[PDB]
Design a binder for this molecule. Structure first.
Ligand code: USV
Length: 107
């Protein structure tokens, strides 16, 4: 599954739901490894629409637990990320992922 651990608090009121456009900054890391990607490298925020399965399941379930303004750590098991296959060259097989996510706004 996905574990959500808060780093810094959001508004405690505005939590995204299916069909909303969520704007975030994030860093993605392998558990027991290093960073593999971040939004903040280019500084252009990452945008996605919740509940359209355009991001991994752990994001779908974990970002839905975040409110606007919040920064949280998401720990995502392989079955909620990229499973047995991964994405060779960036995410290995059977990888647990850790993300530092900051939910900026709904757009
Ligand atoms: C590239 C940005 C996305 C990619 N996706 C969607 C997705 C789309 C197609 C293939 C793999 N993943 C995702 O679901 C998640 C979570 C949202 C932020 C980013 N990733 S990510 O795990 O950091 C990532 C980032 C990058 Cl550069 C490549 C991969 Cl294969 C995965």
């Amino acid at each position: 599954g996905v574990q959500v651990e808060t780093i810094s608090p959001g508004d405690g009121r505005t939590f995204p739901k299916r069909g909303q456009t969520v704007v975030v900054h994030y860093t993605g890391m392998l558990e027991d490894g290093k960073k593999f990607d971040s939004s903040r490298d280019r500084n252009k925020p990452f945008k996605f629409m919740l509940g359209k399965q355009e991001v991994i399941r752990g994001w779908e379930e974990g970002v839905a637990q975040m409110s606007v303004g919040q920064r949280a750590k998401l720990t995502i098991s392989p079955d909620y990320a990229y499973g047995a296959t991964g994405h060779p060259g960036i995410i290995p097989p059977h990888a647990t992922l850790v993300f530092d996510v900051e939910l900026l706004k709904l757009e």
